[PDB]
Amino acid sequence: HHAADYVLYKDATKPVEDRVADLLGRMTLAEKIGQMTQIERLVATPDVLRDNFIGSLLSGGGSVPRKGATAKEWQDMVDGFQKACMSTRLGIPMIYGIDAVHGQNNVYGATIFPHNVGLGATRDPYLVKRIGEATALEVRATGIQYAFAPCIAVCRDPRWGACYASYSEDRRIVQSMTELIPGLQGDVPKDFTSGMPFVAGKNKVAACAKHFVGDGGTVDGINENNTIINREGLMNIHMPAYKNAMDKGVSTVMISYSSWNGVKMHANQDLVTGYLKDTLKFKGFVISDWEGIDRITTPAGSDYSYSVKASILAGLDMIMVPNKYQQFISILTGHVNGGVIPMSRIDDAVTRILRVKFTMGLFENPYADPAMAEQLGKQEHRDLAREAARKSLVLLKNGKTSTDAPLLPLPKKAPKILVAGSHADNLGYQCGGWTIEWQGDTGRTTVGTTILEAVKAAVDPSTVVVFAENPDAEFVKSGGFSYAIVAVGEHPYTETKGDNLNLTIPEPGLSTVQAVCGGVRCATVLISGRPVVVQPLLAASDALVAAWLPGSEGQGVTDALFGDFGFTGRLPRTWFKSVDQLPMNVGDAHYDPLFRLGYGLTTNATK
Numbered sequence: 001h002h003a004a005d006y007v008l009y010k011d012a013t014k015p016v017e018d019r020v021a022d023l024l025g026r027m028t029l030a031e032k033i034g035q036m037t038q039i040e041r042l043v044a045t046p047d048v049l050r051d052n053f054i055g056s057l058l059s060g061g062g063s064v065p066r067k068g069a070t071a072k073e074w075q076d077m078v079d080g081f082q083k084a085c086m087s088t089r090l091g092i093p094m095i096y097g098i099d100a101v102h103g104q105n106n107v108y109g110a111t112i113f114p115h116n117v118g119l120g121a122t123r124d125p126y127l128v129k130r131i132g133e134a135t136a137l138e139v140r141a142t143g144i145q146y147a148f149a150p151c152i153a154v155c156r157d158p159r160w161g162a163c164y165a166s167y168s169e170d171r172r173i174v175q176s177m178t179e180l181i182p183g184l185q186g187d188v189p190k191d192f193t194s195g196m197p198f199v200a201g202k203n204k205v206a207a208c209a210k211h212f213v214g215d216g217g218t219v220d221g222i223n224e225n226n227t228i229i230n231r232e233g234l235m236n237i238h239m240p241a242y243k244n245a246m247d248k249g250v251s252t253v254m255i256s257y258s259s260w261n262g263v264k265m266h267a268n269q270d271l272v273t274g275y276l277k278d279t280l281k282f283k284g285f286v287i288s289d290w291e292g293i294d295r296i297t298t299p300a301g302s303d304y305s306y307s308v309k310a311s312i313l314a315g316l317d318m319i320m321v322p323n324k325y326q327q328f329i330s331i332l333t334g335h336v337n338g339g340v341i342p343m344s345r346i347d348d349a350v351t352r353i354l355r356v357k358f359t360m361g362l363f364e365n366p367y368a369d370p371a372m373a374e375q376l377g378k379q380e381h382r383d384l385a386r387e388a389a390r391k392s393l394v395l396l397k398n399g400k401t402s403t404d405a406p407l408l409p410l411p412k413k414a415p416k417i418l419v420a421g422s423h424a425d426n427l428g429y430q431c432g433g434w435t436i437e438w439q440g441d442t443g444r445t446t447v448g449t450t451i452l453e454a455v456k457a458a459v460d461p462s463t464v465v466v467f468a469e470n471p472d473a474e475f476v477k478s479g480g481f482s483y484a485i486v487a488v489g490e491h492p493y494t495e496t497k498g499d500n501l502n503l504t505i506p507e508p509g510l511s512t513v514q515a516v517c518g519g520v521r522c523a524t525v526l527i528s529g530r531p532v533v534v535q536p537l538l539a540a541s542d543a544l545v546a547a548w549l550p551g552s553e554g555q556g557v558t559d560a561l562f563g564d565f566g567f568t569g570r571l572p573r574t575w576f577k578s579v580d581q582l583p584m585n586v587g588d589a590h591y592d593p594l595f596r597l598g599y600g601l602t603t604n605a606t607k
């Protein structure tokens, strides 16, 4: 189509499938295996990226150009990697992925949205779509084109350390919240074939439905473990939202560390190829989890040759290595050279990877847009996060007896009030895991508003606000306080570090609530990624709110405490009476909840 040096795959006017086929037909085995290889930025250099024809890079949790890096520092880092990839013989751009799972959360100054369990409490799919839209903009502000979200796990046991990453124990709620996908990617057109990948253009990102499949169903909630359930239960609980993700054009799917009835998902040809590809007609790319193929074996990494053969034959397309790319590339090249892995399997993996890259516009816009930098932490997105935080709150108690005056909403004008607890003025605790660091962190780790700061912003100027982190009973009784707001709960965690068989909050938390509430009427705000043992907190408190992990916008909590809005959140999970009941789900013979799925008290906005 015209100029003497015309190359069809470089022609932006050609159909995607024609561009894929034209490029694939020109590639060497080294160029094909390179596309299937994703590496950490920590091991990337210009020569590594060119010499190994690398297809993708990622930042793991906390993998950043430096602490406090600006949006432009991120764009310059990503573009430097891209310039190296674009300089190869074929000039195939790399795709850069990151865990943007509640905002662009590794990045300083990014808006931090509530974690998924609180979003499930909102029952508001359109809110979650808007959160996807804002998240795409803040990810593109940093030059990154690919977000590893949504987690569509259906967490069936809150002892799991990733329960907060699940919208709900009820698959129907998880299905509803797949609206995150067209938020991040853009809406698919009217014509659209389920299972095809879609991203609208340079202001959107590729999404990732994860982790396929049954990651929320593991024995005792043990992370990365075995999910024991018949096919009927797998298909009835854990699978449905993957079909909604196909219908919405999700570009990629990430495989689970978990096993299904003893078969590693990373080695499961029947599910990855037979079901996801051949039954659901998924045409995007399938990516491993981090060292996911290493973990097929016990011990992990003890037969990496088998890990590569089993995973690639199972149908995985792109491997998140993420460090030992030389070994990965060498073993896979040997398997192909030996006839153990057919060329047809390599060509399928590369076809899918290229299909996603051409579809999303990456060959047309491989570099960052400096004009997008200011999207990072934009006030409109903070207002959205504040809306979501407020909608996520579930009021569990509002008065000790049926005849007491309800404590909430609290008055903004009072002579003197107390704000207390470990979680009242700790931005890292209110954001939880996957915030700045992989495991999250403590204190003022990014830009945001703590519960204490939100209270000071909300109250009448005549209201004196006193903060004490862990006051004793006498300090409270002598203080002349009108009421107290006391915030306690879990410390930040992610995945295995969060697996927890007792689900009791760290001390001092309960002791502080008891000291405070013993001296003055108190509203307890519980920060957690899941239900935790709650009867002692309830017995002490006049009012108690499950605020989950509400993110950077602490004013969402005070918006409801002071009656600017009514409480509307409803439990997206069962609240247990004791951990010895677990697992305990609706329909079980022993279903005996402290609070059932859907429970939530309400208030009306103050007049």
Ligand SMILES: *[C@@H]1O[C@H](CO)[C@@H](O)[C@H](O)[C@H]1NC(C)=O
Residues within 6 Å of the ligand: 222, 224, 225, 226, 259, 262, 298
């Ligand atoms: C589950 O965890 C146990 C206990 O640590 C371990 O022995 C086992 O290998 C795990 N099983 C799977 C399938 O991951």
Ligand SMILES: *[C@@H]1O[C@H](CO)[C@@H](O)[C@H](O)[C@H]1NC(C)=O
Residues within 6 Å of the ligand: 499, 500, 501, 502, 503, 504
């Ligand atoms: C509850 O489990 C957590 C994490 O496994 C642990 O750190 C904490 O000390 C436990 N409390 C107990 C065993 O009483």
Ligand SMILES: *[C@@H]1O[C@H](CO)[C@@H](O)[C@H](O)[C@H]1NC(C)=O
Residues within 6 Å of the ligand: 603, 604
């Ligand atoms: C809250 O609104 C509902 C419905 O209008 C009403 O039934 C209730 O009495 C209202 N006010 C209070 C303070 O409960």
